[PDB]
């Protein structure tokens, strides 16, 4: 079976959804963890220095 | 080659010819307290130790003469250039 188009047909599973805490469609309803803000994993807000250039 | 144990020659100390006695330089023992010894201990750590991770070079086919010429009257020795000699045996 082709890994491309033919394998795209079984994709009717809901995972990432609108997050209660940040509003982004990143709350993974299976993991109950937001990949954008960290809700469900961290009380503190998800954030990293690599999200911007080193000297900025 | 052969070489006399004693023979007349110039003494740089006495500043005049006198009988000298020839001897092969016996290696001196290390004390292990030289600066390089302390640097070895100090600088060796986790991982490769740079220069201290190296091992004994090798050998030239024939070594040069390594001798001491001792004045028979003032007892002071002097060193000379050596020359390649597969073997050096003294006469008497």
């Amino acid at each position: 079976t082709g890994a491309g188009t033919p394998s795209q047909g079984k994709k009717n599973t809901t995972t990432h959804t609108k997050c209660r805490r940040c509003g982004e469609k990143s709350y993974h309803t299976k993991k109950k963890v937001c990949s954008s803000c960290g809700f469900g994993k961290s009380a503190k807000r998800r954030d990293y220095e690599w999200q911007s250039k080193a000297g900025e | 080659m052969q070489m006399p144990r004693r023979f007349n020659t110039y003494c740089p100390h006495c500043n005049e010819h006198q009988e000298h006695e020839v001897e092969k330089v016996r290696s001196g023992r290390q004390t292990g307290m030289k600066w390089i010894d302390r640097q070895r201990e100090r600088n060796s750590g986790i991982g490769n130790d740079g220069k201290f991770s190296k091992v004994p070079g090798g050998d030239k086919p024939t070594k040069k003469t390594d001798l001491k010429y001792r004045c028979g009257e003032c007892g002071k020795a002097h060193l000379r250039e050596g020359w390649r000699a597969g073997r050096l045996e003294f006469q008497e």
Binding site: - | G45, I46, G47, N48
Partner: protein
């Protein structure tokens, strides 16, 4: 004349001899069965405690913390590393055990602040330190001219910023002259070289 306290001090100069030796052999049995942070009603080394700021007063707290002995509990590299950075066994943390102890205690009492701490011995695999913490919100402390300083906002989380006695020594701030070129005023402003 000699204070009674001087006797506690003198006994602890040699925790392995005399009566103290036997107390320890007895005590540790119970300690090894206690948790990570145990609040205790009275300091095991009263002289040491009073010397560091302890006062039999409201808002003054003491707790004994146990921490494992030894070097860093470190995981081996999982990617490329030059030989120099491949070690695991001999690497040791730069923060001493006493300091680890002070932090574990402070976290246990989120509202209190660390005043100081001292050692109370060790067995073969762990060390024990008693930490003196203070309630900066209790009026009995806010009115004490000797301790009220610890109530100021800039003293919040002092232990986590190395403002503790053990923190400052471990930071290389003991000496005022030769040797402290890279430690004072801070390790960070000096580029992290001490």
């Amino acid at each position: 004349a000699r204070s009674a306290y001087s006797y506690i001090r003198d006994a602890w100069e040699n925790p392995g001899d005399g009566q103290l030796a036997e107390l320890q052999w007895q005590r540790q049995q119970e300690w090894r069965n206690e948790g990570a942070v145990e609040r205790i009603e009275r300091p095991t080394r009263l002289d040491k405690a009073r010397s560091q700021g302890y006062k039999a007063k409201q808002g003054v707290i003491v707790a004994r913390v146990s921490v494992r002995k030894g070097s860093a509990r470190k995981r081996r590299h999982k990617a490329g590393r030059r030989s120099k950075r491949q070690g695991v066994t001999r690497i040791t943390r730069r923060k001493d055990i006493q300091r680890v102890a002070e932090e574990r205690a402070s976290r246990t009492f989120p509202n209190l602040r660390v005043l100081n701490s001292y050692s109370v011995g060790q067995d073969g695999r762990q060390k024990w330190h008693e930490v003196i913490l203070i309630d900066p919100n209790h009026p009995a402390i806010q009115n004490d001219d000797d301790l009220s300083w610890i109530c100021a906002d800039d003293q919040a989380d002092r232990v986590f910023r190395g403002l503790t006695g053990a923190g400052r020594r471990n930071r290389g701030l003991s000496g005022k002259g030769k040797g402290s070129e890279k430690t004072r005023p801070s390790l960070r402003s000096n580029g992290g070289k001490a």
